[PDB]
Design a binder for this molecule. Structure first.
Ligand SMILES: [Hg+2]
Ligand SMILES: [Zn+2]
Length: 256
């Protein structure tokens, strides 16, 4: 599976029939159809004890991985029951600034999208959590191109050391608080992983406020490779799944 003509999102259903399921992600967020939900509790993003370990090119994106062996960086509140532990973050991005996000907002595509992936600690590990309908919570954050994001630059600067699939580097002492916008206003709906195996285990929390990154920052994302070392070079661009049918879902807003 991949993002090309012969193996991209329109082919995934053959190996992963849940691609045509009832709660697939991403979706278009129709802001006028979403409803404010007073039942939502305040969202709690507690990342001050986060322990990053490594950065990995997995051939689909690059993942910044965390030590999730203790409750050190967690998401709670909002639509969530219980505590969800941060395991990794990654991005999806475009070949041009006009596309790259997975979710869309009134059909608007952003240049990129950040996914902070968390698992529900009552299931003990990530692998058990993805067997559960409420196993995961993904915090999604849009990126637009304008001013640089200072807290992204450490990520940008290490990308040259993980150019190709299967390469990793030490990535300790990175603070993901530097990737968050001012506001935690959000939309939320039930969905799925956006790459194979496309499992329907995710409570999505998508922030309304994008972060701004510079053109030079996103240009460095686009210098990564989908291929392995010594293989013909295929730039890692347009690694996003388009919007999927909303089906029997409602999107709730935390803000009126
Ligand atoms: Hg699941
Ligand atoms: Zn993702």
């Amino acid at each position: 599976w991949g993002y090309g003509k012969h193996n991209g999102p329109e082919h995934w259903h053959k190996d992963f029939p849940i691609a045509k399921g009832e709660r697939q992600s991403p979706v278009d967020i129709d802001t006028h159809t979403a409803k404010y939900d007073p039942s939502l509790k305040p969202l709690s993003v507690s990342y001050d004890q986060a322990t990053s370990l490594r950065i990995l090119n997995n051939g689909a994106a690059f993942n910044v991985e965390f030590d999730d062996s203790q409750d050190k960086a967690v998401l709670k509140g909002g639509p969530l029951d219980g505590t969800y532990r941060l395991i990794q973050f990654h991005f999806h991005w475009g070949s041009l600034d006009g596309q790259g996000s997975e979710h869309t907002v009134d059909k608007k595509k952003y240049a990129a999208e950040l996914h902070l992936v968390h698992w529900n600690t009552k299931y003990g590990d990530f692998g058990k959590a993805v067997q559960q309908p409420d196993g995961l919570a993904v915090l999604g954050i849009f990126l637009k191109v304008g001013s640089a994001k200072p807290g992204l630059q450490k990520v940008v600067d290490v990308l040259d050391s993980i150019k190709t699939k299967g390469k990793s580097a030490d990535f300790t002492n990175f603070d993901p608080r530097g990737l968050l916008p001012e506001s935690l206003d959000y939309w939320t709906y039930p969905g799925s992983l956006t790459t194979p195996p496309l499992l329907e285990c995710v409570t999505w929390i998508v922030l309304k406020e994008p972060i701004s990154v510079s053109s030079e920052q996103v240009l460095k994302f686009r210098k990564l490779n989908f291929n392995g070392e010594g293989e013909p070079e295929e730039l890692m661009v347009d690694n996003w799944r388009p919007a999927q049918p909303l089906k029997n879902r409602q999107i709730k807003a935390s803000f009126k």
